[PDB]
Short mmCIF file of C-alpha atoms in Angstrom, two decimals:
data_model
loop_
_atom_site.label_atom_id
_atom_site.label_comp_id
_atom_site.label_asym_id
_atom_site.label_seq_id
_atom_site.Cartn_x
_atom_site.Cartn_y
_atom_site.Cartn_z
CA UNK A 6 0.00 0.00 0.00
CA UNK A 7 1.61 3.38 -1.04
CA UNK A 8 0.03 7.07 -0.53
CA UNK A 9 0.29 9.14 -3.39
CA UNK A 10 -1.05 12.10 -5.43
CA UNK A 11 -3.07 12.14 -8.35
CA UNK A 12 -0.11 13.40 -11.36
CA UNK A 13 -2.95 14.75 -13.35
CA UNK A 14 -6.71 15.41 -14.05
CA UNK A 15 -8.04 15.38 -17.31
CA UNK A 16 -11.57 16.28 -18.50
CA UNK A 17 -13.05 15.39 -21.53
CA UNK A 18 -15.78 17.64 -22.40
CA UNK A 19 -18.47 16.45 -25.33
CA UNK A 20 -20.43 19.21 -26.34
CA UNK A 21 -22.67 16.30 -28.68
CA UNK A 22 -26.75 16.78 -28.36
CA UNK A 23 -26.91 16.67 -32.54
CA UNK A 24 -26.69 14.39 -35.42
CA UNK A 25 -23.28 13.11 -33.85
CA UNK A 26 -24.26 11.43 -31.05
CA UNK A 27 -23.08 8.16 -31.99
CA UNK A 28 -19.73 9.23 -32.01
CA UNK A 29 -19.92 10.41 -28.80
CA UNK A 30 -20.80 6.56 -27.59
CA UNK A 31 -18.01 5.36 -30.31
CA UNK A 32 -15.33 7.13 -28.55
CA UNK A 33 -16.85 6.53 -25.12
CA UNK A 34 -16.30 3.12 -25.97
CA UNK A 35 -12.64 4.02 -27.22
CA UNK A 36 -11.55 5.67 -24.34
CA UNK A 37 -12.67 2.73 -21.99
CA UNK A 38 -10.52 0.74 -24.12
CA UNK A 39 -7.78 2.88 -24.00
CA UNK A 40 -7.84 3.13 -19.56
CA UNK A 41 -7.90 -0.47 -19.36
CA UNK A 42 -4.87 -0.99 -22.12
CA UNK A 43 -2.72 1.81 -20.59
CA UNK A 44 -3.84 2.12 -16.92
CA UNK A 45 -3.79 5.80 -15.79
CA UNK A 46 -1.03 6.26 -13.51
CA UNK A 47 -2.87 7.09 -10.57
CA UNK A 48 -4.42 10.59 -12.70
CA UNK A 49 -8.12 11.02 -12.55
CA UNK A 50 -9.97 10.82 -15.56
CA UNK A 51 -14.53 12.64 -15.95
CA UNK A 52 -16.47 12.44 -18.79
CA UNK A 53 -19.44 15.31 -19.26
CA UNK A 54 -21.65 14.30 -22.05
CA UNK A 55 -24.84 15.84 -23.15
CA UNK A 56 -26.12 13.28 -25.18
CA UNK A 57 -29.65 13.10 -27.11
CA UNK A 58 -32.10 11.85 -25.66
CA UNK A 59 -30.15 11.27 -22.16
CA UNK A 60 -29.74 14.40 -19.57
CA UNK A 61 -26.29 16.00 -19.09
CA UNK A 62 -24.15 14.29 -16.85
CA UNK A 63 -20.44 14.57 -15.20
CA UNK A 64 -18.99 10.84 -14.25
CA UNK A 65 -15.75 9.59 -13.54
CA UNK A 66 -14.06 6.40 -15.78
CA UNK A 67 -11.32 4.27 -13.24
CA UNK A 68 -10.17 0.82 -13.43
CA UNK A 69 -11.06 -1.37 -10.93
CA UNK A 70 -9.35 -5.08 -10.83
CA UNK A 71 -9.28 -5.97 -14.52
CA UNK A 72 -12.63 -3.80 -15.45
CA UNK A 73 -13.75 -0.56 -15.70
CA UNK A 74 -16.25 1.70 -13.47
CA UNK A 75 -18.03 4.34 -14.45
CA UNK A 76 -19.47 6.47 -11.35
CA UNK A 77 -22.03 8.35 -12.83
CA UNK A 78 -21.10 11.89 -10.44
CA UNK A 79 -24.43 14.64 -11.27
CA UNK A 80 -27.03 14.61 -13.91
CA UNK A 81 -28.01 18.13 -14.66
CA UNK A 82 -31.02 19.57 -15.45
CA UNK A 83 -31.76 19.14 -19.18
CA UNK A 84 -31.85 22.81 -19.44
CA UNK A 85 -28.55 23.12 -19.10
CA UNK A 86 -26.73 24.07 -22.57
CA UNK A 87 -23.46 21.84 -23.15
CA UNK A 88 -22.54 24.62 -25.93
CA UNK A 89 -22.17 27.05 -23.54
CA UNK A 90 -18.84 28.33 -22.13
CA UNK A 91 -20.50 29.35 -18.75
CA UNK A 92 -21.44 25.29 -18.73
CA UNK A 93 -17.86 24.50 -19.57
CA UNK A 94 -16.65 26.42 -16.79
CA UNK A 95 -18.82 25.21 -14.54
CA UNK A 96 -17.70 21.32 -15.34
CA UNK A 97 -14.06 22.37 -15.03
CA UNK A 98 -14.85 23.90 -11.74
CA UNK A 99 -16.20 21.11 -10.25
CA UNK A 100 -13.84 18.62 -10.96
CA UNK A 101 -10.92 20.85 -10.03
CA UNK A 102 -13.12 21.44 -6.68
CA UNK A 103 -13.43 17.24 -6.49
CA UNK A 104 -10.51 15.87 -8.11
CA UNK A 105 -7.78 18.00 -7.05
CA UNK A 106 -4.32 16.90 -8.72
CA UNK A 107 -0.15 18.29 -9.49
CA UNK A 108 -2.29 19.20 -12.65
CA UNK A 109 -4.96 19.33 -15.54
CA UNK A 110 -5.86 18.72 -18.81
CA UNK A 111 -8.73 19.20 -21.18
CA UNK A 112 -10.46 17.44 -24.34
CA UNK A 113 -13.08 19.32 -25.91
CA UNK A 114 -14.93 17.34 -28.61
CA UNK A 115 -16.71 19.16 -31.02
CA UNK A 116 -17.58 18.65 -34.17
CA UNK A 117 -18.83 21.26 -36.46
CA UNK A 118 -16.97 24.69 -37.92
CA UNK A 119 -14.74 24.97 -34.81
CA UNK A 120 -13.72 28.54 -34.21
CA UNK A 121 -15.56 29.87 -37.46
CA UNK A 122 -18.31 32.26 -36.78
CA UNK A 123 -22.08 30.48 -36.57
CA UNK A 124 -22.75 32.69 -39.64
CA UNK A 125 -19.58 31.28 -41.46
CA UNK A 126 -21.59 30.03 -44.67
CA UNK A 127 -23.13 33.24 -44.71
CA UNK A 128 -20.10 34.92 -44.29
CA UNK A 129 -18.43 32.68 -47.53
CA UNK A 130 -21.23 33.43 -49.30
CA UNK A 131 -22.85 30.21 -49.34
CA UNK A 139 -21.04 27.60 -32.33
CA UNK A 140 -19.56 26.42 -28.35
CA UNK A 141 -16.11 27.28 -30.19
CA UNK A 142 -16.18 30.89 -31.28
CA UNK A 143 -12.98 31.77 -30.50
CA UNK A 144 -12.97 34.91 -27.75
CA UNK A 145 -15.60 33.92 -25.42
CA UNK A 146 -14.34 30.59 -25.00
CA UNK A 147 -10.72 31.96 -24.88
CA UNK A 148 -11.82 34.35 -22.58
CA UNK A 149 -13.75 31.48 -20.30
CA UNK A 150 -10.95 29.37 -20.03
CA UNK A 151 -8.30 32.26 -19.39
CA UNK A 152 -8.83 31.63 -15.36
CA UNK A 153 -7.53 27.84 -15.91
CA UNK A 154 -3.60 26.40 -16.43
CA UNK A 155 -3.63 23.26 -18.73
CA UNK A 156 -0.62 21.56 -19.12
CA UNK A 157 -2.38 20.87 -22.53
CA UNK A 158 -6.11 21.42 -24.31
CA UNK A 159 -6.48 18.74 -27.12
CA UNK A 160 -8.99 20.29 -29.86
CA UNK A 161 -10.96 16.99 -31.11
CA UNK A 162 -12.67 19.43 -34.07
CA UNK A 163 -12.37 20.74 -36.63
CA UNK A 164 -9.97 23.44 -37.82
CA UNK A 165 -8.28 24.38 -34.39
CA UNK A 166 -4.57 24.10 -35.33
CA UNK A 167 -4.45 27.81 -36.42
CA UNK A 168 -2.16 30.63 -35.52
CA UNK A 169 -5.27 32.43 -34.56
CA UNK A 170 -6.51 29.65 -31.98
CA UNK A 171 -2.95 28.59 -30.66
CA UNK A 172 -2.70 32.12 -29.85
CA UNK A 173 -5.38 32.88 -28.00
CA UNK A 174 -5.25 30.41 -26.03
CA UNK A 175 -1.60 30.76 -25.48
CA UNK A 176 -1.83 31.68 -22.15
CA UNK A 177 -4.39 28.63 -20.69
CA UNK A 178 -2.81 26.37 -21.84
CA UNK A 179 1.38 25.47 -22.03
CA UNK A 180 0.05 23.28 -25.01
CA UNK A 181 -2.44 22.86 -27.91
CA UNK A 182 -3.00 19.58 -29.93
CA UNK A 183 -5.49 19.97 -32.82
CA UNK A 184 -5.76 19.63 -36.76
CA UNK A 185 -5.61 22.37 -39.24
CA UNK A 186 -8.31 20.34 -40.93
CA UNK A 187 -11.16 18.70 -40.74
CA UNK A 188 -11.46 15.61 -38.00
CA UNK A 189 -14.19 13.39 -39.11
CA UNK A 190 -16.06 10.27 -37.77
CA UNK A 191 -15.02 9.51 -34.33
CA UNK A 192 -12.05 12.09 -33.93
CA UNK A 193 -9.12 10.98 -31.87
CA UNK A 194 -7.89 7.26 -31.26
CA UNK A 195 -8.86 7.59 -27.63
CA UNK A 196 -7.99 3.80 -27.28
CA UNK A 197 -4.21 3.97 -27.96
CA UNK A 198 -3.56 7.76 -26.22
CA UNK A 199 -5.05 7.64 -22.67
CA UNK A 200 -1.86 6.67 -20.89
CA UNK A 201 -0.31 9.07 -22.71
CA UNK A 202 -2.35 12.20 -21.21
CA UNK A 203 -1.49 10.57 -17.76
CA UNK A 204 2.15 10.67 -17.53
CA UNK A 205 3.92 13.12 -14.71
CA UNK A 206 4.25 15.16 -17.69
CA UNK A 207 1.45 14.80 -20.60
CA UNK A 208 2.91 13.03 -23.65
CA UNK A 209 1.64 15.77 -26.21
CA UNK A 210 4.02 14.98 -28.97
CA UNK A 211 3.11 10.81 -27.76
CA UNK A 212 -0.61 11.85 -28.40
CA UNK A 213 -0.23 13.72 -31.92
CA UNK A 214 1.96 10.61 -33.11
CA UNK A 215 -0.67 8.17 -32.08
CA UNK A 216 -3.29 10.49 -34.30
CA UNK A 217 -1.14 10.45 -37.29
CA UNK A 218 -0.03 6.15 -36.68
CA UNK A 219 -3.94 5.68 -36.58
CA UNK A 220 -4.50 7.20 -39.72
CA UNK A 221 -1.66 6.94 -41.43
CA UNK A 222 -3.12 4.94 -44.10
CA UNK A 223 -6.21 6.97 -44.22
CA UNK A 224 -6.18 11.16 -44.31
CA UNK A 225 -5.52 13.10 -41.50
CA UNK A 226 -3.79 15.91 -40.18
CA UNK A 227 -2.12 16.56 -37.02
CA UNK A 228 -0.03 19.47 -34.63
CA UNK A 229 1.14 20.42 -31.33
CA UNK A 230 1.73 23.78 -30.29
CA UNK A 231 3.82 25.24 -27.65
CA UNK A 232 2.26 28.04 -26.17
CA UNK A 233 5.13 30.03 -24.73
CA UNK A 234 6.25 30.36 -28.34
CA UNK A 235 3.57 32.02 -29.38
CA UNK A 236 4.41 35.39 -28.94
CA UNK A 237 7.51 35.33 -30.46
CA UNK A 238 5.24 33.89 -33.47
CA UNK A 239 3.41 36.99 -33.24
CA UNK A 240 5.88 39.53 -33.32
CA UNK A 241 7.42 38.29 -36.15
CA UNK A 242 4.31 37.73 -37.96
CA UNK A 243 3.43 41.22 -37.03
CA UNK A 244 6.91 42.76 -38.53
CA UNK A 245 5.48 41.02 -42.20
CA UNK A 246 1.80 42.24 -41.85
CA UNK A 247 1.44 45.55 -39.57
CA UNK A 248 2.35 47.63 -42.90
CA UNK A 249 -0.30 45.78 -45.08
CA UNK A 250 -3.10 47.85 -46.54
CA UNK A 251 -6.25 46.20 -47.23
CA UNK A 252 -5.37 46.51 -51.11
CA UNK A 253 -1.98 44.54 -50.52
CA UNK A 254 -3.90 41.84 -48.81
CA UNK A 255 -6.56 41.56 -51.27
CA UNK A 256 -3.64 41.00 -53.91
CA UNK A 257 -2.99 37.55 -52.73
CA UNK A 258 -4.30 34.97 -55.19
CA UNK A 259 -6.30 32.49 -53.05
CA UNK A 260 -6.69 30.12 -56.00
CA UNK A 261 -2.76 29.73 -56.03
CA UNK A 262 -2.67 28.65 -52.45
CA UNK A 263 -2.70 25.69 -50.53
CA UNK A 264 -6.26 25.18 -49.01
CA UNK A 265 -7.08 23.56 -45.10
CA UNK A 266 -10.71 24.58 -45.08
CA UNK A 267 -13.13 22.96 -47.58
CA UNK A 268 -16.59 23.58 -45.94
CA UNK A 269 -17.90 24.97 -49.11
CA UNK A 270 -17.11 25.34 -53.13
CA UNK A 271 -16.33 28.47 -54.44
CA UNK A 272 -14.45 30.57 -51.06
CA UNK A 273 -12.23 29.16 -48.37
CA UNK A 274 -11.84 30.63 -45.11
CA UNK A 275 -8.47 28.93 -44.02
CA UNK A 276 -5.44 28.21 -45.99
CA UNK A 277 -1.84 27.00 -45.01
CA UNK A 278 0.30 29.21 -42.92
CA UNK A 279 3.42 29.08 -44.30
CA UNK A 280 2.28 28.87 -47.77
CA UNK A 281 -0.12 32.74 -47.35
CA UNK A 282 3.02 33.97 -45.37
CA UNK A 283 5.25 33.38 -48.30
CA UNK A 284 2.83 35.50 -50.26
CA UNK A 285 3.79 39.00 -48.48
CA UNK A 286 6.87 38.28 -46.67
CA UNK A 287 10.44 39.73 -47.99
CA UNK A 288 13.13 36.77 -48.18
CA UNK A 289 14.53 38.34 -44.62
CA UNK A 290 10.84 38.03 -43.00
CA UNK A 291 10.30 34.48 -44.56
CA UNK A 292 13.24 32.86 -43.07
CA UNK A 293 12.61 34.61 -39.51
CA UNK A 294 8.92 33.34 -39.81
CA UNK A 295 10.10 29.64 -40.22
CA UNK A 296 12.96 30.11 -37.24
CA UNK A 297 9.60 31.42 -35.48
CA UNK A 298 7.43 28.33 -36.73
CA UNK A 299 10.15 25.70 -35.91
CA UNK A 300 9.81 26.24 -31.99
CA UNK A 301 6.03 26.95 -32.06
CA UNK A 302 4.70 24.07 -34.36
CA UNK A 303 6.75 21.49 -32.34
CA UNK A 304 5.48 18.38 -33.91
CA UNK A 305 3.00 18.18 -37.42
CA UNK A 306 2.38 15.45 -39.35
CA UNK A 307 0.08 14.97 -42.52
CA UNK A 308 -1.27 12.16 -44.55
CA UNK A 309 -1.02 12.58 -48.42
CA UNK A 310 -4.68 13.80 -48.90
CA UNK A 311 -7.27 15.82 -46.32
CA UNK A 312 -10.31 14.73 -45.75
CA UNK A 313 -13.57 16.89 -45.74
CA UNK A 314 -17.69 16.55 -44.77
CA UNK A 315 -18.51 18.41 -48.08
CA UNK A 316 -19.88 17.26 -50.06
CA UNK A 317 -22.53 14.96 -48.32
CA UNK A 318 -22.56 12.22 -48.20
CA UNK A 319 -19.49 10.88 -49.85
CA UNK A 320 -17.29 13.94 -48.52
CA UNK A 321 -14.15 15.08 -50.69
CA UNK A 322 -10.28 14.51 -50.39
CA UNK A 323 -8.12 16.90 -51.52
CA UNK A 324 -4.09 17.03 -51.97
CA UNK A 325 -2.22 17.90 -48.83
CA UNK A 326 0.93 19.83 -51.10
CA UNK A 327 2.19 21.91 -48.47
CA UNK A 328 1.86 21.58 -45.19
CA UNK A 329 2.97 23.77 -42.30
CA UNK A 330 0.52 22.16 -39.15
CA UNK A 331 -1.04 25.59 -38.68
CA UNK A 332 -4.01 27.43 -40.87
CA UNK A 333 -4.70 31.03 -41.17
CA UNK A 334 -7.43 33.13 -42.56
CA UNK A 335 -6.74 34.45 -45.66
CA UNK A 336 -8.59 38.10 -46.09
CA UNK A 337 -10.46 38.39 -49.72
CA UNK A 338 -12.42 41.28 -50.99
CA UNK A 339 -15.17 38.97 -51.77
CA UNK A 340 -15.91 38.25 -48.03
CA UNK A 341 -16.00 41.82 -46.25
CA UNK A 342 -18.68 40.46 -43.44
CA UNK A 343 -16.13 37.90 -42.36
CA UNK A 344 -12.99 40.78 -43.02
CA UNK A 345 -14.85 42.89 -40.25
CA UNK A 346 -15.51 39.75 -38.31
CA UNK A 347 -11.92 39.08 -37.94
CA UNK A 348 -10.85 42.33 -36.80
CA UNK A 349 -12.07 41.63 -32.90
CA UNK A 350 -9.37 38.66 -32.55
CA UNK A 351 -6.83 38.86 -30.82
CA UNK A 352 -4.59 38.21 -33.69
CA UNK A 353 -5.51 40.22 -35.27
CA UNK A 354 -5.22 43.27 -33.23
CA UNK A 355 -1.75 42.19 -32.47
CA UNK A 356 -0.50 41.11 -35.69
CA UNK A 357 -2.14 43.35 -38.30
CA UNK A 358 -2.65 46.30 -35.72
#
């Protein structure tokens, strides 16, 4: 018999109660898997899901002898709205308040447009992740890592806002379809003293390696440094100059719709306006930010349904960026109140 502390607490937060349900059970089922493969070296590991057609509830997963338990902790009222930040916060509080530990870390599952406005096919001319308030709801917490199991998160503009909640961010730069992450081959992996965020992004890549997938980590105390040498490329920028990138030469991430794309590569739009002297400190700058990335040949996307498209993965830095076009001056404007924005453009 030995006393000791709990290394780590991790929540994993499904915001489902849509036409995805299933795949909240699917990787329900996955994770379970994964705890009693990997064991969870004495972390502690809840589960809020807000299933349809079954109430909101918080519960703890552990291993007991060779099975699992689940301990099924509150079920909420069903007025209470999983897409909500104030919601999210609330879960987070509570199992900081019960499960104390040396640390934390947080899955959020959502899949959808990720950090794209609600009106984002509106705004292309054709949401519990809009980027500030849940930024801003999650700026009270310290993650040793928040793993972004939707779509479109790897971006400069996401790893940077949450730069300071987190010391890490694991997402794709593309879409994550089906069930999202292998949850049965990377639990012990967010359990370690310290989480195994490059372990975890290989694991996504090995799983569908001979499928289509994308994958990076970001470390957040890079970020700045990202910034301000972004900003020495694009604070001198007129609208005009911007508008004079040719989208249809560039490297897409985002497919959610035909004719305009929100997101392209990094790198790729960066090489676009940068001087050979600001390109080559950008990819210094990208090298210790983007500290692991991997890609299969081809991306996969939802549109269109139902057979979905894949498209050529030609260049691939591990982060996306919005690329501003004259054709889309609603989602221009929308841009302007990120924090990325205000920093990098000015």
């Amino acid at each position: 018999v030995i006393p000791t502390t709990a290394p780590r607490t991790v929540l994993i937060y499904f915001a489902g109660d849509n036409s995805l349900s299933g795949y909240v059970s699917q990787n329900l089922r996955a994770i379970k898997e994964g705890i009693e493969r990997d064991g969870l070296n004495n972390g502690n590991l809840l589960i809020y899901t807000d299933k349809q057609n079954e109430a909101p509830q918080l519960f703890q997963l552990k291993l007991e002898a060779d099975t699992i338990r689940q301990i099924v902790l509150e079920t909420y009222a069903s007025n209470q709205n999983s897409a909500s930040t104030e919601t999210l916060t609330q879960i987070i509080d509570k199992v900081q308040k019960e499960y104390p530990a040396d640390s934390y870390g947080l899955v959020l599952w959502s899949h959808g447009t990720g950090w794209l406005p609600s009106d984002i096919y509106s705004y292309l001319r054709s949401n519990f992740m809009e980027i500030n308030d849940l930024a801003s709801a999650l700026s009270k917490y310290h993650f040793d890592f928040i793993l972004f199991d939707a779509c479109y998160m790897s971006c400069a503009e996401v790893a940077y806002a949450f730069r300071g909640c987190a010391d890490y961010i694991i997402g794709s730069p593309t879409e994550i379809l089906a069930n999202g992450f292998p949850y049965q081959t990377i639990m012990g992996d967010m359990f370690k003293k310290e989480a195994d965020v490059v372990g975890i992004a290989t694991k996504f890549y090995t799983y569908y390696q001979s499928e289509a997938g994308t994958i990076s980590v970001m470390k957040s105390d890079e970020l700045d440094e990202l910034a301000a040498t972004c900003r020495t490329l694009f604070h001198d920028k007129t609208e005009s100059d911007l508008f004079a990138v040719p989208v249809s030469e560039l490297q897409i991430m985002e497919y959610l719709t035909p004719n305009y794309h929100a997101l392209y590569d990094f790198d790729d739009y960066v090489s676009r306006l940068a001087t050979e002297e600001q390109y080559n400190a950008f990819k210094r700058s990208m090298e210790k930010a983007v500290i692991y990335k991997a890609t299969t040949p081809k991306a996969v996307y939802a549109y269109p349904y139902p057979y979905g498209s894949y498209l050529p993965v030609n260049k691939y830095s591990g982060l996306s960026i919005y690329v501003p076009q004259e054709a889309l001056p609603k989602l221009n404007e929308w841009y302007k109140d990120l924090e990325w924005y205000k920093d990098v453009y000015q």
